[PDB]
Amino acid sequence: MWVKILSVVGARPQFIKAAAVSRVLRASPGVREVLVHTGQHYDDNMSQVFFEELEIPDPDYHLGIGGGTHGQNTGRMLEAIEGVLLKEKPDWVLVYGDTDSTLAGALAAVKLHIPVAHVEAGLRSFNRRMPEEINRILTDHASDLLFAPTETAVQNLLREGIPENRIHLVGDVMYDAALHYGAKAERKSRILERLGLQAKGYVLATIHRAENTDDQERLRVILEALAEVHQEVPVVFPVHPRTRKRAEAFGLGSYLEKVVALEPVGYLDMVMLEKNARLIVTDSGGVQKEAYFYRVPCVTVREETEWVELLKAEWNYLAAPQNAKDLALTILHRMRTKGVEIDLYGDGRASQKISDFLRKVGI
Amino acid sequence: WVKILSVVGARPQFIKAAAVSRVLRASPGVREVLVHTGQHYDDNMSQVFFEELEIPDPDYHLGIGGGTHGQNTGRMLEAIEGVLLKEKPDWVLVYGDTDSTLAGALAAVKLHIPVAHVEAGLRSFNRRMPEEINRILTDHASDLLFAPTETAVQNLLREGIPENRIHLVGDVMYDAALHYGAKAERKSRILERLGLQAKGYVLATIHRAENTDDQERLRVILEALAEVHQEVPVVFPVHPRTRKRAEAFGLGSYLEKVVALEPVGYLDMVMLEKNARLIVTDSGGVQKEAYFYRVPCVTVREETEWVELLKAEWNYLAAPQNAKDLALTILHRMRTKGVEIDLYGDGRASQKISDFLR
Ligand SMILES: CC(=O)N[C@@H]1[C@@H](OP(=O)(O)OP(=O)(O)OC[C@H]2O[C@@H](n3ccc(=O)[nH]c3=O)[C@H](O)[C@@H]2O)O[C@H](C(=O)O)[C@@H](O)[C@@H]1NC(C)=O
Ligand SMILES: CC(=O)N[C@@H]1[C@@H](OP(=O)(O)OP(=O)(O)OC[C@H]2O[C@@H](n3ccc(=O)[nH]c3=O)[C@H](O)[C@@H]2O)O[C@H](C(=O)O)[C@@H](O)[C@@H]1NC(C)=O
Ligand SMILES: [Cl-]
Ligand code: NA
Ligand code: NA
């Protein structure tokens, strides 16, 4: 009954998913966990704070890979992860989400015949210019187990020819995380006090996607829209490090001063900011869902989302950044809104469902 | 004019690329760029194809190979992208199903460079085969899928890939046989060199890992071929890895018993194929080629991706479970043939491909 299960994680949102899962595997008797941190997120506010606050053991391995092209990053990680797998020889490799790390892990494993399970499988944007879209498609096609969080994702995998018996709708482990760490956030966050905000008295924003930050006019559209909204309702913005580097390089730095621009916060503070906001504006996948978790209206600053159920339930609304004036107006309009009551993403036990499937599979 | 960059790493990919190159040189507004990833690198596994099939010197040799899946693929992924960044082609073409193919496709698609897969949609339905993974992942990464067969088309549709991205163009390896057949007739002296009479010998190639990494399977095969040899000469251009495995397991004496050769160039292979009474193989290319020349084929495997060849009775599967059983199957199939049928197209697969890229 001694099974070794190795998780590959590279970034903040993967650390959070792995926490939810690791919490449950830690209670599985006879399961040894190994964690490989690939190196993409290394700053202590992007990485270690997740390990501390979320109670995750330090990574068994730090590969320290990041900062180059898709080829460099992905190719160096593929070779580096495979080296770990030949030594650790796990029974299962878990990969999470849709980064270059995810694919590099799936691909390292599948060629060694090591069973791979994709946590958060079958999400599609249908925009292959997104690197994440390639990553999750190829990942999914290389996996033995596909842990789908929604029915859309199930349907996506069936339509690409993947057999039912490898597909499991288990819900979203990020809902487990919100459920299980909520009380701890409540008890230990002092972020509202420290910023001097009260409930329903601000708007929360995050923005980090390449399409939005790698293009000067697009980024300007966003920051100027945020500064405008700030006039009517205060705007709290924990700026991703790369979003700060890009704003700076572009001369848009002045705009961050016109809002409540913070550094990245940890999960417990993030939970309290999200729970207590009037509205959340984001280009993050995870924040989209978490907005819904706390029944706070969301605007997503993208041309599409993989989380289509949120749009359909009216909790989310897309606003591509074409014009600052219009984007501000949309944000203020949507602050007045609410979606319909509905249960998405499961019961908070997606991680237990995952654990059960891993041990009782037949390897 | 439009820039079309081809990634090739192995013998069969040089052959496929030869046929495609032949069309693209003659195309009005096409510049061709060629990347050799470095996977096959002897003269008899590489250079001989460039010389004999009139393939222009590659623009880049990456010189990668000989490591694990992780090493070869990751390093190819990094190096190929470096080339794509300099060259910025309009199309990337990848071929077959090796690690080179997947690395090429994945380098390109993240840079928004349209990828087209030459030989798309083949499936063994055994995902423990590395190339099965490679061609699945490649097909889902590509923009255009050049399928050689109906089965391949159906495989691609079943996986959700839209019919507007799927072109059944036949097989560029049929192009190559057709378009370099004369040349081979003119230049090849190998039958004479080896004292062989047309249709007085059997041709064998064996290189798949499931047959060469398993000592029992390889012994079964090499004993079977030695037995067959007693009835009708067996000629065997031995893949170098296959030689190494045979020597490693102590099976070198079975190679001595047949007419074992080193790998041969394509012109010699065409001549050996044409003129063989029967072909015994685990190669994908060679089983098709057997059919091209209406020579009965035995495939030493439990399945093949080329299922039409079994259906048409030109090919027959023979798993290497027992040396004498395998030999008897081989001798039995020598005096069979399959039905009249036209597979793999008319020899203008490459022309159809060229047209679609504009
Ligand atoms: C490339 C891309 O943008 N793909 C998607 C990407 O995730 P996300 O976009 O959500 O990145 P993030 O926003 O950095 O993190 C969110 C968390 O940080 C917390 N968060 C956020 C800010 C902060 O200051 N502090 C926090 O604790 C929040 O509370 C959240 O819990 O990578 C994910 C992954 O690979 O696993 C994919 O599953 C995912 N795909 C989908 C479809 O949602
Ligand atoms: C992993 C694997 O085995 N994948 C398959 C693999 O092909 P093959 O097995 O045919 O390799 P090979 O036999 O070394 O070369 C044949 C040629 O050599 C010539 N040949 C052969 C021997 C010789 O001594 N001299 C020659 O000129 C012959 O006349 C032939 O023209 O690689 C192909 C590729 O990636 O393009 C895949 O498309 C393919 N997948 C399928 C489905 O067939
Ligand atoms: Cl690096
Ligand atoms: Na659930
Ligand atoms: Na001999």
Coordinates of C-alpha atoms in Angstrom, one line a residue, chain A:
Chain A
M1 CA 0.0 0.0 0.0
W2 CA 3.1 2.2 -0.3
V3 CA 2.4 4.6 -3.3
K4 CA 4.6 7.5 -4.4
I5 CA 2.8 10.5 -5.9
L6 CA 4.9 13.3 -7.4
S7 CA 3.4 16.8 -8.0
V8 CA 4.9 19.3 -10.5
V9 CA 4.2 23.0 -9.7
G10 CA 5.7 26.2 -11.1
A11 CA 3.5 29.1 -10.1
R12 CA 1.2 30.6 -7.5
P13 CA -2.1 29.1 -8.7
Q14 CA -0.5 25.6 -8.9
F15 CA 0.8 26.0 -5.4
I16 CA -2.8 26.7 -4.3
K17 CA -4.3 23.8 -6.2
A18 CA -1.5 21.4 -4.9
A19 CA -2.2 22.6 -1.3
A20 CA -5.8 21.6 -1.6
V21 CA -4.8 18.2 -2.9
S22 CA -1.8 17.7 -0.6
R23 CA -4.0 18.3 2.4
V24 CA -6.0 15.2 1.5
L25 CA -3.0 13.0 0.3
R26 CA -1.4 13.8 3.7
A27 CA -4.3 11.9 5.3
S28 CA -4.0 9.0 2.8
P29 CA -2.2 6.2 4.6
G30 CA 0.8 4.7 2.8
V31 CA 1.1 7.7 0.3
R32 CA 4.5 9.4 0.0
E33 CA 4.3 12.8 -1.7
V34 CA 7.2 14.3 -3.6
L35 CA 6.9 18.0 -4.8
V36 CA 8.9 19.5 -7.6
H37 CA 8.9 23.3 -7.8
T38 CA 10.0 24.1 -11.3
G39 CA 11.2 27.7 -10.5
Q40 CA 8.8 30.0 -12.5
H41 CA 7.6 31.8 -9.3
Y42 CA 10.4 32.3 -6.9
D43 CA 9.8 35.7 -5.1
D44 CA 8.7 35.1 -1.5
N45 CA 5.3 36.8 -2.2
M46 CA 4.7 34.6 -5.3
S47 CA 6.0 31.3 -3.8
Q48 CA 7.1 30.7 -0.2
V49 CA 4.1 32.6 1.3
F50 CA 1.9 30.0 -0.3
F51 CA 3.9 27.2 1.3
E52 CA 3.7 28.9 4.7
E53 CA 0.1 30.1 4.8
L54 CA -1.3 27.0 3.1
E55 CA 0.8 24.5 5.2
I56 CA 2.6 22.8 2.3
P57 CA 5.9 21.0 3.0
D58 CA 9.0 22.6 1.4
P59 CA 9.6 21.3 -2.2
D60 CA 11.8 18.2 -2.4
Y61 CA 13.3 19.9 -5.5
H62 CA 13.8 23.4 -6.9
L63 CA 14.8 23.4 -10.5
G64 CA 15.1 27.2 -10.7
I65 CA 14.0 27.4 -14.3
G66 CA 12.3 30.6 -15.7
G67 CA 12.7 33.9 -17.4
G68 CA 13.4 32.8 -21.0
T69 CA 11.3 31.8 -24.1
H70 CA 8.6 29.2 -24.3
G71 CA 11.2 26.9 -25.9
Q72 CA 14.0 27.5 -23.2
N73 CA 11.7 27.2 -20.3
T74 CA 9.7 24.3 -21.6
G75 CA 12.7 22.4 -22.9
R76 CA 14.9 22.9 -19.9
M77 CA 12.1 21.9 -17.6
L78 CA 11.3 18.8 -19.7
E79 CA 14.9 17.5 -19.3
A80 CA 15.1 18.6 -15.6
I81 CA 11.8 17.0 -14.6
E82 CA 12.7 13.8 -16.3
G83 CA 15.9 13.6 -14.3
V84 CA 13.9 13.8 -11.1
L85 CA 11.4 11.1 -12.3
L86 CA 14.2 8.7 -13.1
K87 CA 15.4 9.0 -9.5
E88 CA 12.1 9.3 -7.7
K89 CA 10.3 6.7 -9.9
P90 CA 6.8 7.7 -8.6
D91 CA 3.7 5.7 -9.3
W92 CA 1.7 8.9 -10.3
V93 CA 2.7 12.4 -11.6
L94 CA 0.2 15.1 -11.0
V95 CA 0.3 18.2 -13.1
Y96 CA -1.9 21.2 -12.6
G97 CA -3.5 23.9 -14.7
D98 CA -1.9 25.0 -18.0
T99 CA 1.6 26.5 -17.7
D100 CA 4.6 25.4 -19.6
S101 CA 5.5 23.5 -16.4
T102 CA 2.3 21.4 -16.6
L103 CA 3.1 20.3 -20.2
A104 CA 6.8 19.8 -19.4
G105 CA 5.8 17.5 -16.5
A106 CA 3.1 15.5 -18.5
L107 CA 5.6 15.0 -21.3
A108 CA 8.5 14.0 -19.1
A109 CA 6.3 11.4 -17.4
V110 CA 4.4 9.9 -20.4
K111 CA 7.6 9.0 -22.3
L112 CA 8.8 7.1 -19.1
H113 CA 5.4 5.3 -18.9
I114 CA 4.7 7.0 -15.6
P115 CA 0.9 7.5 -15.2
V116 CA 0.0 11.2 -15.4
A117 CA -3.1 12.9 -14.0
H118 CA -4.1 16.4 -15.0
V119 CA -5.7 18.4 -12.2
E120 CA -8.0 20.9 -13.9
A121 CA -8.5 19.1 -17.3
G122 CA -10.5 20.0 -20.4
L123 CA -10.7 23.8 -20.2
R124 CA -10.7 25.4 -23.7
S125 CA -10.5 29.0 -24.8
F126 CA -10.5 28.0 -28.5
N127 CA -7.8 30.6 -29.0
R128 CA -4.6 28.8 -29.8
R129 CA -2.6 32.0 -29.7
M130 CA -2.8 31.5 -25.9
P131 CA 0.2 29.3 -24.9
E132 CA -2.0 27.9 -22.1
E133 CA -4.5 26.6 -24.6
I134 CA -1.8 24.5 -26.4
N135 CA -0.5 23.4 -23.0
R136 CA -3.8 22.0 -21.6
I137 CA -4.8 20.4 -24.9
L138 CA -1.5 18.5 -25.2
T139 CA -1.3 17.9 -21.5
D140 CA -4.9 16.4 -21.5
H141 CA -4.0 14.2 -24.5
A142 CA -1.0 12.8 -22.6
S143 CA -2.8 12.1 -19.4
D144 CA -4.1 8.8 -18.1
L145 CA -6.5 10.7 -15.7
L146 CA -8.4 13.8 -16.5
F147 CA -9.8 15.6 -13.5
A148 CA -12.5 18.0 -14.9
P149 CA -13.9 20.8 -12.8
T150 CA -17.0 21.5 -15.0
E151 CA -19.4 19.9 -17.4
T152 CA -18.1 22.1 -20.2
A153 CA -14.6 20.6 -19.6
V154 CA -16.1 17.1 -19.6
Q155 CA -17.8 17.8 -23.0
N156 CA -14.5 19.3 -24.3
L157 CA -12.6 16.1 -23.5
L158 CA -15.3 13.8 -24.9
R159 CA -15.4 15.8 -28.2
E160 CA -11.6 15.4 -28.6
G161 CA -12.0 11.6 -28.5
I162 CA -10.9 11.0 -25.0
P163 CA -12.6 8.0 -23.4
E164 CA -15.2 8.5 -20.6
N165 CA -13.3 6.1 -18.3
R166 CA -10.3 8.4 -18.1
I167 CA -12.5 11.5 -17.5
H168 CA -13.7 12.4 -14.0
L169 CA -15.9 15.4 -13.1
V170 CA -14.6 16.0 -9.5
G171 CA -15.2 19.8 -9.3
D172 CA -12.6 22.5 -8.7
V173 CA -9.8 22.0 -6.1
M174 CA -9.6 25.8 -5.9
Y175 CA -13.1 25.7 -4.4
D176 CA -11.8 23.2 -1.8
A177 CA -9.0 25.7 -1.0
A178 CA -11.4 28.6 -0.6
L179 CA -13.6 26.4 1.6
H180 CA -10.8 25.0 3.9
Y181 CA -8.7 28.1 4.4
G182 CA -11.6 30.6 4.7
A183 CA -11.7 30.5 8.5
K184 CA -8.0 30.8 8.7
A185 CA -8.1 33.9 6.4
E186 CA -10.8 35.4 8.6
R187 CA -8.8 34.8 11.8
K188 CA -5.4 36.0 10.6
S189 CA -5.9 38.7 7.8
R190 CA -5.5 42.3 8.8
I191 CA -5.4 43.6 5.2
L192 CA -8.7 45.6 5.5
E193 CA -7.5 47.3 8.7
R194 CA -4.0 47.9 7.2
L195 CA -5.4 49.6 4.1
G196 CA -8.3 51.2 5.8
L197 CA -11.1 49.7 3.8
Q198 CA -14.5 48.5 4.8
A199 CA -16.7 45.8 3.2
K200 CA -18.3 46.6 -0.1
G201 CA -16.2 49.8 -0.1
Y202 CA -13.6 49.1 -2.8
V203 CA -13.1 47.3 -6.1
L204 CA -10.4 44.6 -6.4
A205 CA -8.3 44.2 -9.5
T206 CA -5.6 41.8 -10.8
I207 CA -4.0 42.0 -14.2
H208 CA -1.1 39.9 -15.5
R209 CA -1.8 38.2 -18.8
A210 CA 0.8 38.6 -21.5
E211 CA -1.8 39.7 -24.1
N212 CA -2.7 42.6 -21.7
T213 CA 0.7 43.6 -20.3
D214 CA 3.0 42.9 -23.3
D215 CA 1.2 45.6 -25.4
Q216 CA 1.6 49.3 -24.5
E217 CA -1.8 50.5 -25.6
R218 CA -3.7 47.6 -24.1
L219 CA -2.0 48.1 -20.8
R220 CA -2.6 51.8 -20.9
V221 CA -6.3 51.2 -21.6
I222 CA -6.5 49.1 -18.5
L223 CA -4.6 51.3 -16.0
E224 CA -6.3 54.5 -17.1
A225 CA -9.7 52.7 -16.8
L226 CA -8.7 51.6 -13.2
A227 CA -7.6 55.2 -12.3
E228 CA -11.0 56.5 -13.6
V229 CA -12.9 53.9 -11.6
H230 CA -10.8 54.8 -8.5
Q231 CA -12.3 58.3 -8.6
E232 CA -15.8 56.8 -7.9
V233 CA -14.8 53.7 -6.0
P234 CA -11.4 53.0 -4.5
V235 CA -9.4 50.4 -6.5
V236 CA -7.1 47.8 -4.7
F237 CA -4.6 46.3 -7.1
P238 CA -2.0 43.7 -6.0
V239 CA 0.2 44.1 -9.0
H240 CA 1.8 41.0 -10.4
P241 CA 5.7 41.6 -10.6
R242 CA 5.8 41.3 -14.3
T243 CA 2.8 43.7 -14.6
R244 CA 4.9 46.2 -12.6
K245 CA 8.0 45.6 -14.7
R246 CA 5.9 46.1 -17.9
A247 CA 4.1 49.2 -16.6
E248 CA 7.4 50.7 -15.6
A249 CA 9.2 50.0 -18.9
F250 CA 6.2 51.6 -20.8
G251 CA 6.1 54.8 -18.7
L252 CA 2.6 53.9 -17.4
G253 CA 4.0 53.8 -13.8
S254 CA 2.3 57.1 -12.9
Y255 CA -1.1 55.3 -13.3
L256 CA -0.4 52.8 -10.5
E257 CA 0.0 55.7 -8.1
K258 CA -3.6 56.8 -8.9
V259 CA -5.0 53.6 -7.4
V260 CA -4.2 51.5 -4.3
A261 CA -1.4 49.6 -6.0
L262 CA 0.1 46.9 -3.7
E263 CA 2.7 44.2 -4.2
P264 CA 1.3 40.6 -4.6
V265 CA -0.5 39.4 -1.5
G266 CA -0.7 36.0 0.1
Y267 CA -3.7 33.8 -0.2
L268 CA -5.2 34.6 3.2
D269 CA -5.1 38.3 2.5
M270 CA -6.4 37.7 -1.0
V271 CA -9.4 35.8 0.3
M272 CA -10.4 38.7 2.5
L273 CA -10.0 41.3 -0.3
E274 CA -12.1 39.1 -2.6
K275 CA -14.8 38.3 -0.1
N276 CA -15.2 42.0 0.9
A277 CA -15.0 43.7 -2.5
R278 CA -17.9 45.3 -4.3
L279 CA -16.7 44.0 -7.6
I280 CA -13.6 42.2 -8.9
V281 CA -11.9 43.0 -12.2
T282 CA -9.4 40.5 -13.4
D283 CA -7.7 38.6 -16.2
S284 CA -7.0 35.7 -13.8
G285 CA -8.7 32.3 -14.2
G286 CA -8.7 31.6 -10.4
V287 CA -9.9 35.0 -9.3
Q288 CA -12.8 34.7 -11.8
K289 CA -14.1 31.6 -9.9
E290 CA -13.3 33.0 -6.5
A291 CA -15.4 36.1 -7.2
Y292 CA -18.3 33.7 -7.8
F293 CA -17.4 31.8 -4.6
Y294 CA -18.0 34.9 -2.6
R295 CA -21.0 36.1 -4.7
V296 CA -19.2 39.3 -5.8
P297 CA -19.8 40.4 -9.4
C298 CA -16.8 40.0 -11.8
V299 CA -15.6 41.6 -14.9
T300 CA -13.0 39.7 -16.9
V301 CA -10.6 41.8 -19.1
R302 CA -10.2 39.3 -21.9
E303 CA -11.7 38.3 -25.2
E304 CA -12.8 35.0 -23.8
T305 CA -12.8 32.8 -20.7
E306 CA -12.7 29.1 -20.2
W307 CA -15.1 29.5 -17.3
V308 CA -18.1 29.9 -19.5
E309 CA -20.6 28.9 -16.8
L310 CA -19.8 32.2 -15.0
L311 CA -20.9 34.2 -18.0
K312 CA -24.0 32.1 -18.4
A313 CA -24.9 32.5 -14.7
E314 CA -24.3 36.3 -15.0
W315 CA -21.7 36.4 -12.3
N316 CA -19.1 37.4 -14.9
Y317 CA -19.0 39.7 -17.9
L318 CA -16.1 40.1 -20.5
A319 CA -14.8 43.5 -21.3
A320 CA -11.9 43.4 -23.7
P321 CA -9.7 46.5 -23.3
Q322 CA -10.3 48.5 -26.4
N323 CA -11.2 51.8 -24.8
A324 CA -10.4 53.2 -21.3
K325 CA -13.7 55.2 -21.1
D326 CA -15.9 52.2 -22.0
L327 CA -14.0 49.8 -19.8
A328 CA -14.5 52.0 -16.8
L329 CA -18.2 52.4 -17.5
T330 CA -18.6 48.7 -17.8
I331 CA -16.9 48.2 -14.5
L332 CA -19.1 50.6 -12.7
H333 CA -22.2 49.2 -14.4
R334 CA -21.4 45.6 -13.4
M335 CA -20.7 46.7 -9.8
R336 CA -24.5 47.1 -9.7
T337 CA -25.1 43.5 -10.7
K338 CA -25.5 40.0 -9.3
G339 CA -25.7 36.6 -11.0
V340 CA -28.3 33.8 -10.4
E341 CA -28.0 31.4 -7.5
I342 CA -26.3 28.2 -8.6
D343 CA -23.8 25.7 -7.4
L344 CA -20.7 25.2 -9.5
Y345 CA -17.3 23.6 -8.9
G346 CA -18.6 20.9 -6.4
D347 CA -18.9 20.4 -2.7
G348 CA -15.3 21.2 -1.6
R349 CA -14.3 17.6 -1.8
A350 CA -12.8 17.5 -5.3
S351 CA -9.4 16.7 -3.7
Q352 CA -10.9 13.6 -1.9
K353 CA -12.4 12.4 -5.2
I354 CA -9.0 12.9 -6.8
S355 CA -7.2 10.9 -4.0
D356 CA -9.7 8.1 -4.2
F357 CA -9.3 7.7 -7.9
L358 CA -5.5 7.7 -7.6
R359 CA -5.1 4.9 -5.0
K360 CA -7.9 2.7 -6.4
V361 CA -6.9 2.8 -10.0
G362 CA -5.0 -0.5 -10.7
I363 CA -1.3 0.4 -11.2

